[PDB]
Amino acid sequence: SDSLSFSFINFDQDERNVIAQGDARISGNNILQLTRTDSDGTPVRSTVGRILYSAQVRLWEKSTNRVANFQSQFSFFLESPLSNPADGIAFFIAPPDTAIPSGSAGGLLGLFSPKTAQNESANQVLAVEFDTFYAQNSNTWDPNYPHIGIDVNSIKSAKTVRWERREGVTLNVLVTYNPSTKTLDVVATYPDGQRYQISVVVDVTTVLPEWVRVGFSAASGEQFQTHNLESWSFTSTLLY
Amino acid sequence: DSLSFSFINFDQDERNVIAQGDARISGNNILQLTRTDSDGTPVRSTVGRILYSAQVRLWEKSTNRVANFQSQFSFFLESPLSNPADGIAFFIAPPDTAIPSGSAGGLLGLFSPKTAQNESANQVLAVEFDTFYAQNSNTWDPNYPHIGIDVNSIKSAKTVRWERREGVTLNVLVTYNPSTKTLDVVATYPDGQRYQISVVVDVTTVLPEWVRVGFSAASGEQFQTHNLESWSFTSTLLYT
Ligand SMILES: CO[C@H]1O[C@H](CO)[C@@H](O)[C@H](O[C@H]2O[C@H](CO)[C@@H](O)[C@H](O)[C@@H]2O)[C@@H]1O
Ligand SMILES: CO[C@H]1O[C@H](CO)[C@@H](O)[C@H](O[C@H]2O[C@H](CO)[C@@H](O)[C@H](O)[C@@H]2O)[C@@H]1O
Ligand SMILES: *[C@@H]1O[C@H](CO)[C@@H](O)[C@H](O)[C@H]1NC(C)=O
Ligand SMILES: *[C@@H]1O[C@H](CO)[C@@H](O)[C@H](O)[C@H]1NC(C)=O
Ligand SMILES: [Ca+2]
Ligand SMILES: [Ca+2]
Ligand SMILES: [Mn+2]
Ligand SMILES: [Mn+2]
Questions:
Q1: Which residues of A touch B6 (CB under 8 A)?
Q2: Cα–Cα–Cα angle for B43, B12, B90, rounded to 5 degrees
């Protein structure tokens, strides 16, 4: 597999190329609802939901030293009745058999396990998070404000940019990886043009195995919010 | 909504290919569809096929959408025979398509003998590169080597005369334009010799909404290797 690209303008309830994990569901409105809701559609506590595209991505090839670029465009919105809505949605890359880690329903966003969430040598996850909950005595790894973060085998982001949550408002996001500069880029924009940028230098060949899957994860612990992905398009090309 | 992938060559640890029958990846990273012996010599009575694992949304009734697609591939054939058989085809079929019974020969791994010329029993769209045409056996063929477009029948809706070139790679582009409902084929040899064949066909009447795409080849009493060097594919669903 030298390249893979796909696009979801919206989500089909009869979608064939998605792996749904945990509470992830596609609504009759063609929205992917990651975290669980009750019978009235209200977000609930202690829920994790993830999707992965079924086709695997060859992110790099050790035997010829090729490394893939990639680009992921998506838009999402969050809804909650709470003052401190939690926990956040993330675009992430992980090994093809990745499953929801134990104890990940909360600040670990469905991506990490508590005893190893800050130990990079125990993880294989590259993620772009949209973190809404940052209480310093529980989400201790976080900056003390909502943020967009790039996670490199740790729930403690290698870099963050301050971010404003907007109840029910769609955020459009472009994540790009340039192999030649080993730069992972993140641009996020609200409908009014309000923008957020963040980037890090990361060598994916030391962070992830050669074959990966790509997708999204969201979680709520004691505090909750819905995490609604509306669209997603991805592209990756393996290059010398 | 859309999908694209490419194989510059074939990885022996591929994850997104469904192989059927005798298809395998060689040490040169070539997809060898039909069976070969231990010296790489073609053998009788063999079918091999591959399908990309991710399913293609070829059309959607409820939104009156039909997808375009393009398939770019290079293959070469080798045989010691003066009448080498039977051919390779790019094809599209329902997602659970399996090698039909009796299809190791002129049916190209695509059709079953009883139903091979009965469009009412088949769900196959294919572009075939047919090297064997003996009129008392492959009665459905024209009496010469040919490239043909097959619509639910081994009897091509249209063919163009073609020349087989031993061991030479043929470059093929197949495109489907849903606004003109035209499937066309441009095949080119390295010296520039070109072949053109096209058919007005409405995919919504020949194939289900969800399909898989790939290749098939076969040999019956006569034989040849059917070697796929590369394949790139893209498909986008558009309003019609
Ligand atoms: C109001 O709940 C906060 O305080 C509780 C007790 O001090 C914590 O248990 C709780 O943490 C859990 O929920 C948060 C928010 O969903 C989550 O980030 C964390 O991982 C725990 O699951 C929260 O801090
Ligand atoms: C030399 O074999 C030819 O004549 C034989 C006797 O009539 C046929 O059996 C034979 O047909 C089978 O092989 C061909 C070539 O591989 C294939 O096209 C056909 O489907 C049969 O499997 C061939 O015509
Ligand atoms: C980090 O994880 C590694 C194994 O992946 C382990 O050997 C090490 O003890 C861990 N370090 C800490 C501080 O937990
Ligand atoms: C053609 O196929 C259809 C559907 O399988 C079947 O009903 C019909 O009897 C066939 N006609 C023939 C055998 O010519
Ligand atoms: Ca957090
Ligand atoms: Ca034939
Ligand atoms: Mn964070
Ligand atoms: Mn033919």
A1: 1-3, 237
A2: 60
Q: Please, which residues 189-218 of chain B have a Cβ atom closer than 8 Å to chain A?
A: 210
Residue-number span of the structural domain to which B193 is assigned: 1-240
Q: How far is CA A40 from CA A36, A37, A77, A131, A226, in A?
A: 11, 8, 18, 25, 12
d(CA B48, CA B40): 15
CA distance to partner chain A, nearest, from residue B222 (Å): 33
Ligand 2 atom with the shortest distance to the CA of B223: 16
Which of B110, B129, B221, B226 to probe ligand 2 with, by most ligand atoms within 8 A of CB? Answer: B221
* Ligand 1 binding pocket includes A106 (Cβ within 6 Å): yes
Residue at token pair 């959408």: B65
Enumerate residues 6+ apart whose C-beta is below 8 A from B15.
A1, A55, A56, A96, A211, B53
Give the helix/strand (H/E) hosting B3: strand B2-7
- Our count of domains for chain A comes to 1
Separation of alpha carbons B186 and B71, rounded Å: 11
Q: Name the nearest CA neighbour of A37 among A3, A96, A81, A102.
A: A81
Contact, A21 vs A213, CB < 8 A? no
CB of residue B138 inside a 6 A radius of ligand 2? yes
Q: For a pocket test of ligand 4, which of B120, B122, B124, B153 has the largest count of ligand atoms closer than 8 A to its C-beta?
A: B120
What residues contact residue A105 under an 8 Å CB cut-off, 6+ apart?
A: A46, A47, A48, A219, A220, A221
Interface check for A13 against chain B (CB to CB < 8 A): the answer is: no
Kindly report the CATH number assigned to the domain that includes residue A108. Answer: 2.60.120.200
The experimental technique used to determine this model is: X-ray
d(CA B154, CA B96): 20
Cα separations in angstroms, B85 against A26, B89, B196:
48, 13, 22
B124 three-class SS = coil
d(CA A9, CA A17): 14
How many contacts does A have with B, using Cβ atoms within 8 A? Answer: 59
Best of A6, A13, A70, A240 to substitute, by most chain B Cβ atoms within 10 angstroms, is A6
Return the H-helix or E-strand segment holding B227: strand B225-239
Structure's resolution in angstroms: 2.2
